[PDB]
Amino acid sequence: SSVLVLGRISDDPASHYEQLKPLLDYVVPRMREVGIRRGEILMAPDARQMSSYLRRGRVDWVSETTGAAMLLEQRGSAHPLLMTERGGLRDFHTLFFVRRDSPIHSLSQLRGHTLALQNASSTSGYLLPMLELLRNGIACDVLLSADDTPARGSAGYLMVGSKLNVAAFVHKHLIDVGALSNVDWDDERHMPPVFKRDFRIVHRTAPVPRAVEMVRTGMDPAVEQRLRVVLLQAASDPKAGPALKRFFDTTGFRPLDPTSRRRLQELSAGVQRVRDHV
Numbered sequence: 001s002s003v004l005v006l007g008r009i010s011d012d013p014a015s016h017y018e019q020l021k022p023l024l025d026y027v028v029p030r031m032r033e034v035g036i037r038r039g040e041i042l043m044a045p046d047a048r049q050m051s052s053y054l055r056r057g058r059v060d061w062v063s064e065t066t067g068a069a070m071l072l073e074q075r076g077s078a079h080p081l082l083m084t085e086r087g088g089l090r091d092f093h094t095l096f097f098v099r100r101d102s103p104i105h106s107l108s109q110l111r112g113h114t115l116a117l118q119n120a121s122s123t124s125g126y127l128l129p130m131l132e133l134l135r136n137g138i139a140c141d142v143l144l145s146a147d148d149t150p151a152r153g154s155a156g157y158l159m160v161g162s163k164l165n166v167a168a169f170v171h172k173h174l175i176d177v178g179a180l181s182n183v184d185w186d187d188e189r190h191m192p193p194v195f196k197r198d199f200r201i202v203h204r205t206a207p208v209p210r211a212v213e214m215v216r217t218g219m220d221p222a223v224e225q226r227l228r229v230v231l232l233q234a235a236s237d238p239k240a241g242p243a244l245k246r247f248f249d250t251t252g253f254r255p256l257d258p259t260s261r262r263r264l265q266e267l268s269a270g271v272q273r274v275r276d277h278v
């Protein structure tokens with residue numbers, strides 16, 4: 001509370017630390033007038049833990065994709081501060097892809113087949129695709145290992161963790177279908193050209209806002225207000241340039257508005273439905 005703690009859900013804190021510290025170092029001095037003297041970074045392995053941190057006041061501010069964000073809001077532990085633009089894109093969506101030699105051409109043909117997902121905190125790699133399956137009445141049971149098989153009439157999913165693993169398992173004929181964001185598709189660390197050329201997109205979800213800054217329930221309203229002001233000013237401060245590049249290539253922030261609120265509310269309903277029916 002004299003300290004501002006910035007976090008995110010991370011499966012790779014060694015690497016994500018570097019993404020957060022530069023902007024935290026930019027923010028902290030600019031919050032002195034609301035009692036902030038110092039900054040810390042605290043990441044969490046998953047949404048549940050991060051929700052616990054948030055609820056207990058151990059993390060103040062996270063920058064997350066909107067689905068994860070809604071997991072946090074649903075648990076009562078955080079609320080939106082700013083909508084976040086990353087790599088010049090305000091929105092993203094999930095794509096389902098297969099090997100081009102697969103006999104799958106549509107989402108409906110996932111029945112009988114396996115899907116690679118990421119982890120439960122992933123928007124584009126779990127929440128969105130699972131939501132999509134729910135809307136289309138496509139059952140998708142958790143599979144225990146790559147030797148496990150779906151019931152006939154149903155799909156099944158395997159959690160492979162990383163985005164590269166989704167691409168790799170599908171490429172290597174271990175899993176029939178993969179889910180990634182449309183942005184991930186064009187990001188060569190996640191979707192290597194050597195794999196991508198063997199893939200076909202079979203389905204696209206509707207776009208949602210891509211990312212959002214969340215602050216914890218009970219943050220002091222003056223800290224909240226000033227944080228918002230500081231981030232809003234960052235996008236056009238040259239002294240914030242390198243820090244924002246490191247911060248998931250943040251290219252913009254903007255105030256919440258009735259549209260983004262409505263879109264987060266619809267996404268939140270969808271996430272809740274996924275949560276309720278898994």
Ligand SMILES: [Cl-]
Nearest residue numbers: 065122123124
């Ligand atoms: Cl995501």
Ligand SMILES: [Cl-]
Nearest residue numbers: 209259260263
């Ligand atoms: Cl929006």
